[PDB]
Amino acid sequence: ERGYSFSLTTFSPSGKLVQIEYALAAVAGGAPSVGIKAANGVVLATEKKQKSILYDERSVHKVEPITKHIGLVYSGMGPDYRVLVHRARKLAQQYYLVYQEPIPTAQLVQRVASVMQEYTQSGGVRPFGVSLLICGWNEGRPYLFQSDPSGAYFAWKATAMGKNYVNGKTFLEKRYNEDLELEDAIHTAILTLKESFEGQMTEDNIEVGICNEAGFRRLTPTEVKDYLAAIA
Amino acid sequence: EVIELPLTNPELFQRVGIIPPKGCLLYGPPGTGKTLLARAVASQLDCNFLKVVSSSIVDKYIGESARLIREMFNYARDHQPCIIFMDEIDAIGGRRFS
Amino acid sequence: MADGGSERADGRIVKMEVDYSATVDQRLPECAKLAKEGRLQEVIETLLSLEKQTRTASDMVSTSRILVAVVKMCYEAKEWDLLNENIMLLSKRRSQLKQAVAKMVQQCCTYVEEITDLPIKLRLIDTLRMVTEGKIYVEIERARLTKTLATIKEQNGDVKEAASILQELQVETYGSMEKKERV
Amino acid sequence: MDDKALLVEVQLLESKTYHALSNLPKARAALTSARTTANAIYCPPKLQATLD
Amino acid sequence: TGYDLSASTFSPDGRVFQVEYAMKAVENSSTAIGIRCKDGVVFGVEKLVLSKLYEEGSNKRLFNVDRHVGMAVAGLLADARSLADIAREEASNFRSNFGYNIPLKHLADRVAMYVHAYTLYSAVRPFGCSFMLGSYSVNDGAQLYMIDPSGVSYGYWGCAIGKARQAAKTEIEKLQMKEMTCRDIVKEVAKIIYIVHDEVKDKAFELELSWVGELTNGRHEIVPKDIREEAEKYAKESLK
Amino acid sequence: CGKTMLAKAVAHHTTAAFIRVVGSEFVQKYLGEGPRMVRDVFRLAKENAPAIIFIDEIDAIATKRFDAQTGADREVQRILLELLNQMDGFDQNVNVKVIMATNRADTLDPALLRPGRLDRKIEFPLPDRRQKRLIFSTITSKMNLSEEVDLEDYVARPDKISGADINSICQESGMLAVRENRYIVLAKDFEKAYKTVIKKDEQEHEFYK
Amino acid sequence: GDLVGVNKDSYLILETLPTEYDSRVKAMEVDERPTEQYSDIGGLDKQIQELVEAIVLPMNHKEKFENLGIQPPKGVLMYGPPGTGKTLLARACAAQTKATFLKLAGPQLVQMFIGDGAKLVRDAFALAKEKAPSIIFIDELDAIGTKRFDSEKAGDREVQRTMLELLNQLDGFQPNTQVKVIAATNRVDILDPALLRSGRLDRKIEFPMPNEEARARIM
Amino acid sequence: GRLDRKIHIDLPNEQARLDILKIHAGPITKHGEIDYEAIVKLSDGFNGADLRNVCTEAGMFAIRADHDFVVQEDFMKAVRKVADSKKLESKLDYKPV
Amino acid sequence: SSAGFDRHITIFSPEGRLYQVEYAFKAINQGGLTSVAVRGKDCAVIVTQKKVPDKLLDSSTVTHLFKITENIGCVMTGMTADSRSQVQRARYEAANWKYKYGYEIPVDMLCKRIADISQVYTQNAEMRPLGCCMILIGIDEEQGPQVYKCDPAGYYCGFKATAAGVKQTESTSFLEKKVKKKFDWTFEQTVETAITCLSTVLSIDFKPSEIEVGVVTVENPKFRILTEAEIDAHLVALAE
Numbered sequence A: 001e002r003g004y005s006f007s008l009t010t011f012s013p014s015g016k017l018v019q020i021e022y023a024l025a026a027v028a029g030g031a032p033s034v035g036i037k038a039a040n041g042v043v044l045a046t047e048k049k050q051k052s053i054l055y056d057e058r059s060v061h062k063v064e065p066i067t068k069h070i071g072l073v074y075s076g077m078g079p080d081y082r083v084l085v086h087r088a089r090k091l092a093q094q095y096y097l098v099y100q101e102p103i104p105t106a107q108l109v110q111r112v113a114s115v116m117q118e119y120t121q122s123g124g125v126r127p128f129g130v131s132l133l134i135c136g137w138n139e140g141r142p143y144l145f146q147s148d149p150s151g152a153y154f155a156w157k158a159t160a161m162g163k164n165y166v167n168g169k170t171f172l173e174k175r176y177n178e179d180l181e182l183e184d185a186i187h188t189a190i191l192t193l194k195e196s197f198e199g200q201m202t203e204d205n206i207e208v209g210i211c212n213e214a215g216f217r218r219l220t221p222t223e224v225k226d227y228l229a230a231i232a
Numbered sequence B: 001e002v003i004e005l006p007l008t009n010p011e012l013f014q015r016v017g018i019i020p021p022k023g024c025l026l027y028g029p030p031g032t033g034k035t036l037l038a039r040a041v042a043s044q045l046d047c048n049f050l051k052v053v054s055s056s057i058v059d060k061y062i063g064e065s066a067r068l069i070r071e072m073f074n075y076a077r078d079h080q081p082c083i084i085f086m087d088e089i090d091a092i093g094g095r096r097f098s
Numbered sequence C: 001m002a003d004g005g006s007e008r009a010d011g012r013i014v015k016m017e018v019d020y021s022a023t024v025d026q027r028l029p030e031c032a033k034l035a036k037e038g039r040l041q042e043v044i045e046t047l048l049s050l051e052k053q054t055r056t057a058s059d060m061v062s063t064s065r066i067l068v069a070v071v072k073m074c075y076e077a078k079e080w081d082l083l084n085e086n087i088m089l090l091s092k093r094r095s096q097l098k099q100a101v102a103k104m105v106q107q108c109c110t111y112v113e114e115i116t117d118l119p120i121k122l123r124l125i126d127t128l129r130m131v132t133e134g135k136i137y138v139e140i141e142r143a144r145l146t147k148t149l150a151t152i153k154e155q156n157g158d159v160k161e162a163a164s165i166l167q168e169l170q171v172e173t174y175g176s177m178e179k180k181e182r183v
Numbered sequence D: 001m002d003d004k005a006l007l008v009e010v011q012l013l014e015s016k017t018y019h020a021l022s023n024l025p026k027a028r029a030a031l032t033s034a035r036t037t038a039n040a041i042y043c044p045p046k047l048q049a050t051l052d
Numbered sequence E: 001t002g003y004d005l006s007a008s009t010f011s012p013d014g015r016v017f018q019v020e021y022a023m024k025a026v027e028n029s030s031t032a033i034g035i036r037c038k039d040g041v042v043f044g045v046e047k048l049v050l051s052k053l054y055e056e057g058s059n060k061r062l063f064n065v066d067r068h069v070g071m072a073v074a075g076l077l078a079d080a081r082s083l084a085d086i087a088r089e090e091a092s093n094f095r096s097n098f099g100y101n102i103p104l105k106h107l108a109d110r111v112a113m114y115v116h117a118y119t120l121y122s123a124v125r126p127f128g129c130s131f132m133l134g135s136y137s138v139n140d141g142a143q144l145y146m147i148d149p150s151g152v153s154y155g156y157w158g159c160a161i162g163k164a165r166q167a168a169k170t171e172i173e174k175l176q177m178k179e180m181t182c183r184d185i186v187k188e189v190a191k192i193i194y195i196v197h198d199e200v201k202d203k204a205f206e207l208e209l210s211w212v213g214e215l216t217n218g219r220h221e222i223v224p225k226d227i228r229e230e231a232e233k234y235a236k237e238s239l240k
Numbered sequence F: 001c002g003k004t005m006l007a008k009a010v011a012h013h014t015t016a017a018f019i020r021v022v023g024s025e026f027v028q029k030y031l032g033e034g035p036r037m038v039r040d041v042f043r044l045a046k047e048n049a050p051a052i053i054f055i056d057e058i059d060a061i062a063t064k065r066f067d068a069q070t071g072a073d074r075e076v077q078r079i080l081l082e083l084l085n086q087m088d089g090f091d092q093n094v095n096v097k098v099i100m101a102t103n104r105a106d107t108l109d110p111a112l113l114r115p116g117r118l119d120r121k122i123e124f125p126l127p128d129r130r131q132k133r134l135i136f137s138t139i140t141s142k143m144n145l146s147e148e149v150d151l152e153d154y155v156a157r158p159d160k161i162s163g164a165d166i167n168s169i170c171q172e173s174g175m176l177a178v179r180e181n182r183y184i185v186l187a188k189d190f191e192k193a194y195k196t197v198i199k200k201d202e203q204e205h206e207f208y209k
Numbered sequence G: 001g002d003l004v005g006v007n008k009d010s011y012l013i014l015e016t017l018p019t020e021y022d023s024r025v026k027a028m029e030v031d032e033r034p035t036e037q038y039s040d041i042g043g044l045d046k047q048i049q050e051l052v053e054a055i056v057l058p059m060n061h062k063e064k065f066e067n068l069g070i071q072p073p074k075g076v077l078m079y080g081p082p083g084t085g086k087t088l089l090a091r092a093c094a095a096q097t098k099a100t101f102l103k104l105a106g107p108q109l110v111q112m113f114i115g116d117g118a119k120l121v122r123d124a125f126a127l128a129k130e131k132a133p134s135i136i137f138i139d140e141l142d143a144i145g146t147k148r149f150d151s152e153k154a155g156d157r158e159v160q161r162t163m164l165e166l167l168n169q170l171d172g173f174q175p176n177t178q179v180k181v182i183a184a185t186n187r188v189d190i191l192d193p194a195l196l197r198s199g200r201l202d203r204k205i206e207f208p209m210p211n212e213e214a215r216a217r218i219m
Numbered sequence H: 001g002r003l004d005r006k007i008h009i010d011l012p013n014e015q016a017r018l019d020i021l022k023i024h025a026g027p028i029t030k031h032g033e034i035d036y037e038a039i040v041k042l043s044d045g046f047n048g049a050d051l052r053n054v055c056t057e058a059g060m061f062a063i064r065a066d067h068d069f070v071v072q073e074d075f076m077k078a079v080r081k082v083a084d085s086k087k088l089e090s091k092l093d094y095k096p097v
Numbered sequence I: 001s002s003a004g005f006d007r008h009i010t011i012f013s014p015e016g017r018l019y020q021v022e023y024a025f026k027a028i029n030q031g032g033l034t035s036v037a038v039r040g041k042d043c044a045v046i047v048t049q050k051k052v053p054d055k056l057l058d059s060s061t062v063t064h065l066f067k068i069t070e071n072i073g074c075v076m077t078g079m080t081a082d083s084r085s086q087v088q089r090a091r092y093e094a095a096n097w098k099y100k101y102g103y104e105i106p107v108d109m110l111c112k113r114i115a116d117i118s119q120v121y122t123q124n125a126e127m128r129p130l131g132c133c134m135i136l137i138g139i140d141e142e143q144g145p146q147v148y149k150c151d152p153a154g155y156y157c158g159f160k161a162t163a164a165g166v167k168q169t170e171s172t173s174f175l176e177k178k179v180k181k182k183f184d185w186t187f188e189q190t191v192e193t194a195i196t197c198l199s200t201v202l203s204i205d206f207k208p209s210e211i212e213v214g215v216v217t218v219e220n221p222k223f224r225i226l227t228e229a230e231i232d233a234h235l236v237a238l239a240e
């Protein structure tokens, strides 16, 4: 068959791209998320909620490992997340085949952003509807990055995304600093996620990921319950 | 259970400690018997029973449309056991415009 | 339906006396499913009356032996369960449990002259958990008064019995009582 | 930092310790500061009674 | 409006409109019925004569798909011929690949998938033909299937398509077809088509009958002329 | 959300005069009655005592746009103008207080809210979490609830209940108890009544997020 | 509610007058008959018979229905592409029958003052009820029957509210069995479903374009 | 507080369609065996107001051909004469909110 | 709420939504049928209803259950042709996985591959996103029974009790009420609960000829369809 071969994203009379704005508006309605780094590693926290008790909470995951030391979380549309995850895995594989070394974080961020940008200029397609957070630990210094449906990216110390992201950023403004440890970072991440959380926070509604110079991994529900207790 | 019982055996609800509902609406697709039900109730329940279609209580003079409603509720208040049935209330109950 | 149960009753009236209470279980289903029918206004009530008479006869025979307290509780719980499985409100609009409770009350008041702890105190605990419903309010009164009176006379004591009798604040509320008895 | 309730608690504690040491003006001033800093809390479910 | 211009737009209530328009295009075809017997199937088509100039045997609507499989079509002739050709090529391909005559449960499915492939995209239009496939095998008995332009195929004991489909199936159901051999079925098929399409609607017409079953040792062909003559002679008696 | 119960409670507990009217009673078939029926109310309240006036559903006569060619709009305009004049004529000495209630405040004429006429705006929002427990406790303190029914099970539930149908929850559960010829409420009654009244499924496509 | 004539000065009652009807309703009654025998119609042999058996036979042969325990049909709609013989059939039927015939058109009921239209509707039914065997014909029905809808800024309501009176003189709370209703339109995808209900419009005849043999007969 | 209970009145289950057919069919001088279950199986999504029409059409089919009784074939014609005319009625169901 | 061609193709509306996909969800309900799936301690059950309105139609070919693999079974709802096409794609994908990796395919990978295939239709503006649902049941080593569900928007998940069709909401409510009690689950109990759920949602009290049941268990992981006799056996055992 064939496609259409004409761009669906065009310039308005006021010099603005409408579709990117609508994609950002769709992103703003997703599940909230928070990300922090303090001098030793990075913490990614996200909130998950099944509609009823029928759903199995251990069947799918939000935090996904690209490789041994890169982590990624999302906010926005659901199905579009897997395509980006799969593409990132492929890209890391070609990099490792060519150079025989684990990929640096910045290169992976740049390549993923390039794909996401290219997806808004071709013909007969519509842009993605997610916003990503990427974390890693290479050569000692930890790294945190955030993407954008338009393809741009930034580097952050602490970031909040999803619903009520403005309140999260203001809250992090008066709390975060440049010298803490991973445990206190976890404490403040749960504290700031409690701002818009549900009535009762259980050990299964929350997913937490930690990166240190030992590798990326996803916290099991037991220690998540341990952290939820003795706090708040 | 709503219109017949608390009209004739009122102390039960007093004992339990509640006041019975005042009214209910019948809804559903066309032709499923909504008027036939009210005809049967009217024919086989001994009470006082006013019955009107809401489309025909309107007229062009400046205030009659509200006066008539005040009149019919006064009439019901004087004749103490009574039922008000009025049909097709979407004719006047519509959402209020801006 | 109606006369088939009469024939079965006239048949097993002797069998129950000759046999043990196990056949009661064998006679439990066939009557209970009849309450499922409920096709006529008075057949089901007479049926359940016959079966309640059978249950009270078995209770008398059992409490005559050591099966006084350990099996009466099972009897009452099973009859409540049979009501649950059959139509609610005990099969029909008629209480169809009022007669059972009244007969058991008569047995408690008169037959158990030797009111040992298990024969009377336990039987009252069992029968006072049918208190909640309105249909049988009058009996739960008489039973409450009898319980308090027995406790007072036999053991003396005080305060607790007074508290028990007071809690029947519905004495005023009960419509269908003789005025003098209320007084 | 973020925490404001603990500020209310310690302010009330200083109010109590000044009052027990028989220094009325400073105790009243500390209580006033605690009241001002306790008016912005979303809900002090039990602390409100102690303050009052 | 405008929700009913492409084949790739769901209407607000959630259904496709072009396929429904194809359906309404089918409902103006003439008529065609087909019923299965104890040991085969029988098709029947009434063909209208528009003017005296045309010759008998023109534009047959009873197509022969394969050496043991037959087809009867209703709708637009051009699309019907295209479908017949694609089914014929597919059957030959199957015989070449594996090595034996294709069963109905596979051929009907493949043609149904190919027809359904033309209802998703906006670059092509849906087909406009509804057709019936019939066959008989010694190891599988008689088989009858019906396929509609939306892409749905079912199995039937007897079916009718065209204008007076329901009127025909009314007298179809009265028959106890489950028992008799399809030697006497020809007379009742002729009778059931002469009891429809009043002469007020059109002046003249003609009958086309097919035949397949164990009686022909697996081959599919038109009925002999004398048998059809006797069948219509019997069917004329409905004037009583 | 209970705008009228404040009026009822203050009417019960007051020590001064009270007057209540409905905003839609002023329009009259005989022309010229509306202004008179406004000015006499204000005169009576003025000369009587430290009175309080209450008007319910002011949307009937106080709206924004008009059409000066139909008769009825002219009459309503005259009513509103005279009401503004009469309210403005007070001399900050008489002790008369005016209460007005409305349902949709967006369709109101702005000139009615100018300073000196209606200087206080009070909002009655939906109960959230703390008011639910209090409303359940106060409504159910009258009934015969059995010592087995939990209320914290129903309060914590997410749905945005108003204040006008918690009463309906309790009332319907009582009716379920009455149907059984039993005079004590059980937990299953609240469970079934709460299921019956709300009846909201999801409307919540879950690939949104 | 009775209407009485009164002495101007004492106000003593002096007469009882006949009931009065709006003159706009008394004007929609035919008086000089059309003159079109069914001979002047070609091709429509089915639809003529399906009309006549539905709204003429129940007038003359009452026993033929009573003697079997049935109710005659309530009313007929006829629809189809413009230029087919609908209004021609209405004129023919009016020319053959003896009964009182009322002729009406939908747009004529749209009136400026609120409530003035419903009054005309019920007054027309009330007039027909008095002339025992009367029949009533509504043309251009699609001017009234447009589907109701939901709106929050502004919308149309007065015509909807007269339609809800029409839908109640047919069927409704008290059955009327004495007057026959015909209605006509050329578009049906417009109309409100609650109007199409089986109890109100009972036989829905449809008119096709003439095939080859009918055109010869028309010419 | 103003309208306290809301009572949904809905299209009949097949058992109810049998009940209503037995109601409206009775007075007809019907003749020979009749099998209502076929009718109940064909009529799907019918209103109560359509089954009355089926019963009227059945007799209308027998006023033609000069009979004075009804037979099951008439019901089986009338069912389909009605059932296909519902195609031109909109299919929406509306519900309060 | 709309501006431009957002109502006709799959692009974002101003609020951030897109309607050409949520129209398919209400296109699901066009069939007017409901299916239920239950998972037990060591078995999984799929139950559905079937309706045959006419006697002429052959009742042996109206099944909605399909054997995707000797160990994995499925049930479909919605438009028939789309469901058949999705069945075809699933069969091909499972066979390809077996060819390539040399061992049987897990159910979750199959569901993910199907959902990823379906997600493209809601990304490009020239296709229509296939309004048909998906339910699969299977057995996995060290996990036991597994029940997964897939939708036209590309959202797959793993459930413990599922219903798909017209009566989805109240059936899920009833299943939740039953499962909150946390009682032991065996084969007979699971089948009884699954049947009674549909029986009380529809209020039919039906016969052993109007439903279909499929079951899998850890004694013969082959997917099997219950015969009418044993279905009647469960039905009578349910009614004491």
Ligand SMILES: Nc1ncnc2c1ncn2[C@@H]1O[C@H](COP(=O)(O)OP(=O)(O)OP(=O)(O)O)[C@@H](O)[C@H]1O
Residues within 6 Å of the ligand: B029, B030, B031, B032, B033, B034, B035, B036, B037, G171, G172, G194, G197, G199, H020, H023, H047, H048, H049, H052
């Ligand atoms: N459940 C039913 N049982 C018996 N007859 C019924 C039933 N439902 C409808 N009918 C028939 O419907 C006809 C009149 O319908 P009815 O007056 O009930 O309309 P309705 O359902 O209230 O419609 P609408 O919503 O348009 O007012 C009568 O012939 C009556 O016999």
Ligand SMILES: Nc1ncnc2c1ncn2[C@@H]1O[C@H](COP(=O)(O)OP(=O)(O)OP(=O)(O)O)[C@@H](O)[C@H]1O
Residues within 6 Å of the ligand: F001, F002, F003, F004, F005, F102, F103, F135, F163, F164, F167, H001
């Ligand atoms: N403490 C309470 N707070 C709020 N509502 C209550 C409370 N106690 C009872 N209610 C219920 O609130 C309902 C609201 O009644 P009310 O007439 O006051 O409403 P309203 O807000 O004036 O409504 P509207 O503007 O629609 O007339 C009452 O019928 C009562 O049952």
Ligand SMILES: Nc1ncnc2c1ncn2[C@@H]1O[C@H](COP(=O)(O)OP(=O)(O)O)[C@@H](O)[C@H]1O
Residues within 6 Å of the ligand: G040, G041, G042, G043, G081, G082, G083, G084, G085, G086, G087, G088, G186, G218
């Ligand atoms: N046999 C016929 N069939 C159809 N139309 C006819 C026939 N004979 C005459 N006509 C023409 O049909 C017209 C009738 O108007 P009509 O088509 O009914 O308007 P509408 O259908 O919009 O009501 C007349 O002008 C008449 O000349």
Ligand SMILES: [Mg+2]
Residues within 6 Å of the ligand: B034, B035, G172, G173
């Ligand atoms: Mg009605």
Ligand SMILES: [Mg+2]
Residues within 6 Å of the ligand: F003, F004
């Ligand atoms: Mg109020």
Ligand SMILES: [Mg+2]
Residues within 6 Å of the ligand: G086, G087
């Ligand atoms: Mg005309």
